[PDB]
Structure formats: structure tokens, C-alpha cells
Amino acid sequence: SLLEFGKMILEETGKLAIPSYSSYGCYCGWGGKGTPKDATDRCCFVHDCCYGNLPDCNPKSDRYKYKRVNGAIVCEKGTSCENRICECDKAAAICFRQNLNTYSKKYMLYPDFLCKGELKC
């Protein structure tokens, strides 16, 4: 679920998902169009694609379980949709951690009109 994703994001990065990743660049929190602004925004692009791979799942609300095996996220078995959602979220949280070094606060609340063009998944 979105709330679990946000807890995963905070755990990985120490930033709060709202506001650090809820309105960032072209794809975080409200993606759709545009060239992603940086690597963090590409994490969100890929995460959006990842959810897009699951048209009959409901990643905003469906809850999954995961645990940590020293540091590492391990998705626990739920329904097929929960497993696949968890793997999307795990990847994005790891991606955000891998790209913290280039996170830029100037992409928070990034205006829509600066995001133009479709980029295929």
C-alpha cells in the first residue's frame, strides 16, 4: 500500500515520503509524462512502470508484508498481487537510497508544465 511504501522509503532514506518523494520531478507521487529530471525521478518512472505491469492489482491500497534480513528487504509471501507490488516498492526504495547523493530539493513540487512528452516503459 502507499502507506507501507512510505514507511519503506523513510526506513531506507531517512526522508519522509510526504514531502520528499510525493511531488518530486515528473514521476514521483504523480507521474505521467516528461523526461525524468534526475536519477531519483527515474526511480519513480520505473516504479510507475512497475505498477503499470500490474493492471489488475491495486498498489495504493493492497497491503503486503516484508521483513529485513540484516538491512535487506525480503518480501513475504501474500497474494500474487501483493508479492509483485512489494517487489516494485522494494526496488524503488533501494533506488531512492542509491540516488540520495543526487537528490535535489529544487525538484520538490515540480510544476507539471515542465514535464512534457511520453517516455515508454
Binding site: 502507499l2 512510505g6 515520503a17 510525493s22 514521483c28 504523480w30 510507475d48
Partner: peptide
Amino acid sequence: VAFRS
């Protein structure tokens, strides 16, 4: 929270 695309 987030809630994109």
C-alpha cells in the same frame, strides 16, 4: 500520500 500516474 504519493498516488501517481
